[PDB]
Structure 1
Amino acid sequence: PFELSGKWITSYIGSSDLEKIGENAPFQVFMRSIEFDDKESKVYLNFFSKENGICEEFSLIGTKQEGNTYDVNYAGNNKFVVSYASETALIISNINVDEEGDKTIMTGLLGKGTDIEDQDLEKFKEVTRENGIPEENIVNIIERDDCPA
């Protein structure tokens, strides 16, 4: 029986728009935890993000929708899905439509800490590729995560 809730840190993130994941951008998200409240059809996301160089913590709440989709507001409108889940990893696929109306598909490999299992990385790279996102559009987040645990 898989436990999806608990501690989750971001390892890598891929994006179809490089403007959304660079330094201090809205989507260079350093995850800390995700909680799935299936009874109340919600999801609780806690993470850090840099703005003007300093770490800023977030606590959002998303509502479960059609299929395995999750709706959440943050730098536009998001609809994310957990494309993969194993005892060591979680791979999220997300679609953002910012305030301007531009659509960006993103992906992320989350884990239990700073130690990556290449098996989960290959799956993450395979999902990223399927979303038509190129390898040069992948950023290592563990090397950039200097925010508080």
Structure 2
Amino acid sequence: PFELSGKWITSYIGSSDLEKIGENAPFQVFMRSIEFDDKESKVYLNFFSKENGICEEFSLIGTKQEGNTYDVNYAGNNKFVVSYASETALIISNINVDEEGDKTIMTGLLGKGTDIEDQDLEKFKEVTRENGIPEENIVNIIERDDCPA
């Protein structure tokens, strides 16, 4: 089988709205771990983001919802699915509705730490594309993640 829980670090993120992912933006997210607790219908997320250019750490809890889905409060309301899982990667698709009501679709490629497999990367690009997110709306997060391990 397939272990979904553990260390996951963000390699790349794509977004329908570039305001949500540049420097210091709420969805420029540097993942550190995700733990799925299906017994209690919960997911545990630990990650860094930057504000004011300095690392801040978050540990959040989402709730398992209908189908394959999870709801979590962060910079508005979020519904995400693990669209793809391999031994080496997860691709997450997330819809965020922010505090103004604006809706953003994002995708995120995660791995076990820095050395990306091209096969996982190609699947990320296809999922991103399928969600209507253009290639130039992809940020390389590996390059930007200087937060603590």
SS of residue matched to 2:144: coil
Deviations along 1:82-134, whole A, 9 cap, x unmatched? 00000000000000000000000000000001000000000000000000000
Give me the whole-angstrom Cα distance separating, in 1, the residues matched to 2:78 and 2:4.
20
Give me the whole-angstrom Cα distance separating, in 1, the residues matched to 2:113 and 2:29.
15
Note the C-alpha offset of 1:140: 0.2
- Matched residue pairs, number? 149
Give me the whole-angstrom Cα distance separating, in 1, the residues matched to 2:122 and 2:143.
19
Note the C-alpha offset of 1:36: 0.1
Normalised by the length of structure 2, the TM-score is 1.00
Gaps of 5+ in 1: none
Give me the whole-angstrom Cα distance separating, in 2, the residues matched to 1:56 and 1:130.
32
**1:52-67 matches, cutoff 5 A:** 52-67=52-67
Note the C-alpha offset of 1:58: 0.2
**1:1-149 matches, cutoff 5 A:** 1-149=1-149
Give me the whole-angstrom Cα distance separating, in 1, the residues matched to 2:143 and 2:136.
16
Note the C-alpha offset of 1:21: 0.1
Give me the whole-angstrom Cα distance separating, in 1, the residues matched to 2:123 and 2:43.
24
Give me the whole-angstrom Cα distance separating, in 1, the residues matched to 2:135 and 2:97.
22
Note the C-alpha offset of 1:25: 0.3
Gaps of 5+ in 2: none
- Tell me which stretches of 4 or more aligned residues in structure 1 moved more than 3 Å: none
Q: Percent identity?
A: 100
SS of residue matched to 2:126: helix
**RMSD over aligned Cα, in angstroms?**
0.2
Normalised by the length of structure 1, the TM-score is 1.00
